Amino acid sequence: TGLSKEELLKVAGSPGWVRTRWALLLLFWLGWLGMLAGAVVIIVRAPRCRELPAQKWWHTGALYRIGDLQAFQGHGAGNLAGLKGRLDYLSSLKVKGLVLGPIHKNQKDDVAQTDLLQIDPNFGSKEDFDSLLQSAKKKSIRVILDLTPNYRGENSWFSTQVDTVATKVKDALEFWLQAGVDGFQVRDIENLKDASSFLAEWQNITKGFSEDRLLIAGTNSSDLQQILSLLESNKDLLLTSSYLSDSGSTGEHTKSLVTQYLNATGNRWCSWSLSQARLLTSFLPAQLLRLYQLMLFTLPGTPVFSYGDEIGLDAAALPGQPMEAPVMLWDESSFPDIPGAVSANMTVKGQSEDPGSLLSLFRRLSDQRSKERSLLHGDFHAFSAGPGLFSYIRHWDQNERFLVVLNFGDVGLSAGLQASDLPASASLPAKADLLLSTQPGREEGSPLELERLKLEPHEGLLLRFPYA
Amino acid sequence: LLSACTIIIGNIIGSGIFISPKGVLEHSGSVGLALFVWVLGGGVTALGSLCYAELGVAIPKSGGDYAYVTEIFGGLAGFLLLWSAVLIMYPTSLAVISMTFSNYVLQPVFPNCIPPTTASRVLSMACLMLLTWVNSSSVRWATRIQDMFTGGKLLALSLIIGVGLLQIFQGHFEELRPSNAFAFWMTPSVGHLALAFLQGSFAFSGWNFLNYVTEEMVDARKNLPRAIFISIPLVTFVYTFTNIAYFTAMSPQELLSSNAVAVTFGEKLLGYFSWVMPVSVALSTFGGINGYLFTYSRLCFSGAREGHLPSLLAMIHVRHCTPIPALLVCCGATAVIMLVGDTYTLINYVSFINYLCYGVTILGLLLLRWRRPALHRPIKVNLLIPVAYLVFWAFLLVFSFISEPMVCGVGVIIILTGVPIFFLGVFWRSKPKCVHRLTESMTHWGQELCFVVYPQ
Ligand SMILES: *[C@@H]1O[C@H](CO)[C@@H](O)[C@H](O)[C@H]1NC(C)=O
Numbered sequence A: 001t002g003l004s005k006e007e008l009l010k011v012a013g014s015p016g017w018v019r020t021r022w023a024l025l026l027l028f029w030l031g032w033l034g035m036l037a038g039a040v041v042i043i044v045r046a047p048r049c050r051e052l053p054a055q056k057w058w059h060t061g062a063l064y065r066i067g068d069l070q071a072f073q074g075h076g077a078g079n080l081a082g083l084k085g086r087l088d089y090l091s092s093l094k095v096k097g098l099v100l101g102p103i104h105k106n107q108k109d110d111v112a113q114t115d116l117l118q119i120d121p122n123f124g125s126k127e128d129f130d131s132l133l134q135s136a137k138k139k140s141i142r143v144i145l146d147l148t149p150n151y152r153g154e155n156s157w158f159s160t161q162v163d164t165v166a167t168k169v170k171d172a173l174e175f176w177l178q179a180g181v182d183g184f185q186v187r188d189i190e191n192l193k194d195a196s197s198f199l200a201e202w203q204n205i206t207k208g209f210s211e212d213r214l215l216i217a218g219t220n221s222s223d224l225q226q227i228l229s230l231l232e233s234n235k236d237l238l239l240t241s242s243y244l245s246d247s248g249s250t251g252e253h254t255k256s257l258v259t260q261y262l263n264a265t266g267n268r269w270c271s272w273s274l275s276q277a278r279l280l281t282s283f284l285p286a287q288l289l290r291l292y293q294l295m296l297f298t299l300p301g302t303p304v305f306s307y308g309d310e311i312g313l314d315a316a317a318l319p320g321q322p323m324e325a326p327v328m329l330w331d332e333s334s335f336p337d338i339p340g341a342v343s344a345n346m347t348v349k350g351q352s353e354d355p356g357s358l359l360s361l362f363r364r365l366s367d368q369r370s371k372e373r374s375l376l377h378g379d380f381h382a383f384s385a386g387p388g389l390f391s392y393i394r395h396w397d398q399n400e401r402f403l404v405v406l407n408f409g410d411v412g413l414s415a416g417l418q419a420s421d422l423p424a425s426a427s428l429p430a431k432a433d434l435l436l437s438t439q440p441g442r443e444e445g446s447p448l449e450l451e452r453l454k455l456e457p458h459e460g461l462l463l464r465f466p467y468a
Numbered sequence B: 001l002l003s004a005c006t007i008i009i010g011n012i013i014g015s016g017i018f019i020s021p022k023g024v025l026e027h028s029g030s031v032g033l034a035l036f037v038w039v040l041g042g043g044v045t046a047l048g049s050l051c052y053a054e055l056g057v058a059i060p061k062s063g064g065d066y067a068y069v070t071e072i073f074g075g076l077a078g079f080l081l082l083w084s085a086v087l088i089m090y091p092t093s094l095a096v097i098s099m100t101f102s103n104y105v106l107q108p109v110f111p112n113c114i115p116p117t118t119a120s121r122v123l124s125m126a127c128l129m130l131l132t133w134v135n136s137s138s139v140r141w142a143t144r145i146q147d148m149f150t151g152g153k154l155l156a157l158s159l160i161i162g163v164g165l166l167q168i169f170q171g172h173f174e175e176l177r178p179s180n181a182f183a184f185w186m187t188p189s190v191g192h193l194a195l196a197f198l199q200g201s202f203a204f205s206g207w208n209f210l211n212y213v214t215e216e217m218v219d220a221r222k223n224l225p226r227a228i229f230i231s232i233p234l235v236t237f238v239y240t241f242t243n244i245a246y247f248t249a250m251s252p253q254e255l256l257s258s259n260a261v262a263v264t265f266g267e268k269l270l271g272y273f274s275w276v277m278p279v280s281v282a283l284s285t286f287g288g289i290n291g292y293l294f295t296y297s298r299l300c301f302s303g304a305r306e307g308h309l310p311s312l313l314a315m316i317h318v319r320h321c322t323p324i325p326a327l328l329v330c331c332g333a334t335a336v337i338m339l340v341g342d343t344y345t346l347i348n349y350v351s352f353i354n355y356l357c358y359g360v361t362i363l364g365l366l367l368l369r370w371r372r373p374a375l376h377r378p379i380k381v382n383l384l385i386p387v388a389y390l391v392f393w394a395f396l397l398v399f400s401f402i403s404e405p406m407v408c409g410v411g412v413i414i415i416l417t418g419v420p421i422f423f424l425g426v427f428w429r430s431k432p433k434c435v436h437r438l439t440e441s442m443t444h445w446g447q448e449l450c451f452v453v454y455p456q
C-alpha cells in the first residue's frame, strides 16, 4: 500500500492546510444555512391548499326513486321485506338514497280518513319498516319517505281546505323523525296555495331535529320564473321540476337552459332530473339515453333517477305496462302477462354480463361520481362549443380536471374548442387522456388531441387531465 | 439471546412501515390481500434469515454477503455484490428515508395538496448533511442519538398499536369484516402481486445486517436460531397490527389518497395531540439515516481489507477516529440519486436488487453444501428452505422483470458495468506507472485534505 504516516501527516498538514479545512467547514455550514433559508422561502410563498366544503349526505351520489313497490318486485313480492332483499343490487348501483313511498293510508278522497301517521298493511307492518331502515342504515343507503297526502286520487292535495292537511303533514314529519327517516318528499305543489310558506315551515321543522335531513319538493312547471318564486325564501330545498322536459335535440339549446338556470340562482345546489315521477325514456329516443345519463352524472348537483332508468325500461314500447309504474324486469319471466314479449337484453340478468350495456355505463359513472373530488364538489365552467356541441370543465383545487363533450346532433362534427373562457388554473392542455365514450369503438386510456377531435353523431366523451 | 434480539428488532424497523402501506394496498386491491402480503413477507424473511444464520456459522469470517460469496464463488462475484451494495442498495435506502422525512415534515402545512418538490428535496438534503456532519464529528454522540431515536420509533409504534386496539374495543371494524375486507376494486394479477410484494419487502429490509457483527457475537450457535425465532414473528405481528390500526382508523380509498398515512391517522384520532406523532415519526426516519451510515462505513473498511476498494476510503480521522471519506462518498451518491427518481421507483429498485443479492447468496449456500460436504457446520438446515426460497425468488424475479422492465433493466445494467472495472483494476496486475502515480497522488491529496491515516 501507499500512504502517509501519522507523524508524517502531522508534519505536512500543519502549516497551511488548517486554514483550508476551517474555510471549507465554514463554507459548508453557510451553504447549509442558506439551503434551510431557501427552503423556508419557497415554503412561505407557496400556493396554499383549498379548504374542503364539508359535504352532506345528499351530495356525494345520486338518489333512486321508487314510485310503487308492486312493480319493483312483481306480483307476490311487492313488500318491504322483499325490498329488504334488493339492497345488494341497490348498493351495486352505488346510490346514496331512496325516495320510497307513499305508503301511508289513503283509501279514496277522504280527508278525515287519510292518516299520515299509520302504515298501510298492504305494503307491510311498522316492524318491517324498522327492519328495512336498520338494514339500509347498516349499508349506508338512506331512506327518504314520500308524503303526498293523496296518491290514489286525481287531486294530490284534496279539494277541501288544506290547513288540516298541513297539520297532518307536520305531525307526519315529527312522527317519522321519531322513527328515523332521513328526509321527506312532496309532489304536485302546484295545486298547493301559498306553498312557499308551508315549504319554509316544513324545512324549518325537518332541519330542527338535525342538520342531516332534507326536504324535496316536486312540480310540473317547465318555465324558469316560477321556480325562483318558490326558491326565493328557501335556500336548502331540493326542487325537482320538468325544466328539461323539452328535448330539442340541440346542444346549444340545452346549454342555454342549463347556463341560464345556474346563473339565475347563482351557484346553489340543484337537482337534475327531467320530471318528478317519470322516467327518462318518456321524452327521449333509444340513442339519447347513453348521452343524457352522462350529462346528468357530470353536472353540478344531485342527480335524481327513477327505477328502471339504468336499464332503459320503457312502457311505450312494451304493451301491458301502465306508464305510471311499469313492471321492472329482472329476467325473462318478470313479465308473464304476454309470454315471449321480452328479450334477455332488456333485463337486469342479461345486462350484468355485457360490458357494452347501459347498466355498465350507469355503474361506471356512479362509481366515478361517488369518489372523485372534482365531480363531487368541483367548479363547473362552460366554454364555447361547436354547431351543436355542449362542453364543460369540472375542476377543484389541485385534483384531476375533467372535460365533458356532448353531441346532441345527428350529424358528425368537429371539436372546435375555443379558449379564453376559463381561469388561468384550468387551461385546456394540448392532449388529454380519454376516460370513456357513449358508444363502442373508442380506445380507452389513449391520450386524444383537443384540436382535431371529431364527433360521431349522438356521442359523448368524458376525458381527464391532471393539474397543469 | 436478548442481547442480540434487541439489535435484530432495531435494524429491521426503520421507516418502511410509514411508506409501504400506501404502496402495497394500491397494488393489493383489498384489505385481506394486503394483510396477507405482509405475513408472506414475514415468512420469506424468516426463511432467508435461517439460511443466512447457517451460512454465518459455517464460515466464521465476518462481512456478511461480501464475505460469504467471496469465499464460495470467488473474487468477481464478491466484487460485483460489493459494487451493487455501494452504488444502489445503501444510497437508495438513504434517499428513500430522507424523502420520507421531508414528506412527513411538510404534510401538516399542505394537508390536502402535495407540497412543493423543491422545498422537499432541499429539506431532505439538509437533514442528510446534518446527520453526515454529526457522524463525522464523533461516534459516542452517534450511538446515544441512535438509541434516543430507537426509543422514539418504539414509542410511535406502541402508540399506534394502542390507539388501534382502543378503537377495536369500541366496535369500529367495518373494513375488517369479510363483507368489506374482500371488496376488490381491481382484479389483482400476478405481476401486480409481485410489485406489491416488492413494495412490502422494503419494510423488512436490513435483517442481514446482523451477519456484519457475527464475530462480535458470543456463542452464536445457540442464540442465533433462538434470536431469529423470537424476532421475525414478533416483527410480522407488529407490522400486521399497525396495518390493522391504520385500516380501522381510515378508509382504504382515503388511505390511498394521503401522502402520509400516519399523519392522517394522527389528525383524525389524536385530535389536539396530533402534533405528537409526526415529530415522533420524524425521529424514526432520523434513526434510519444515521444507522445506515454506520453500516456503510463498516462495509468500506472491509472493502479495503480484501484489496477491492482504494485504501483512502478506509482511513480514519487522526484525532476523532471517524471514517470521513466513506461518509462523504455516501452523501454524494445519495444526493445524486435523490434528484432523479420518486420514492416508489427507488423502492422498486432497492427491493429488486436486494432480492437478487439474497438469491445469489442462497445459491452460493447450496453450492457450498455440494462442494464441501465434510465441512463442520454447527447447525444444518433442511433442503426445503433453500429450494422453496430459490423457487419463490425465481418466480418473483421473472414476474417483476415482466411487469416493470425499465427499472430492473437499469439496475442490471448498472451491476453489469462493474465487471470491466474489476477486470481493469484487480485482475489486471500490470498497471502502467502512470496509473500508480495517479493513485498515489490522489491518495496523498485525500490524506492531506481530510487529515486521515490508515487504521492500526
Ligand atoms: C327555522 O326556525 C327557527 C326557530 O323558529 C328560526 O330561528 C329560523 O330562522 C328558521 N329558519 C328559516 C330558514 O326560516
Ligand SMILES: *[C@@H]1O[C@H](CO)[C@@H](O)[C@H](O)[C@H]1NC(C)=O
Pocket (backbone or CB within 6 Å): A190, A191, A220, A221, A222
Ligand atoms: C302543470 O300543472 C298545471 C296546474 O294543474 C296544469 O294546468 C298543467 O297542464 C301542468 N303541466 C304539465 C306539463 O303537466
Ligand SMILES: *[C@@H]1O[C@H](CO)[C@@H](O)[C@H](O)[C@H]1NC(C)=O
Pocket (backbone or CB within 6 Å): A259, A260, A263, A264
Ligand atoms: C347572468 O346574469 C349576469 C348579470 O346580468 C350576466 O352578466 C351574465 O352574462 C348572465 N349569464 C348568462 C349565462 O346568461
Ligand SMILES: *[C@@H]1O[C@H](CO)[C@@H](O)[C@H](O)[C@H]1NC(C)=O
Pocket (backbone or CB within 6 Å): A286, A343, A345, A346
Ligand atoms: C336488444 O335490444 C336493443 C334495444 O332495444 C335492440 O335494438 C336490439 O335489436 C336487441 N337485440 C336482439 C338480438 O334482440
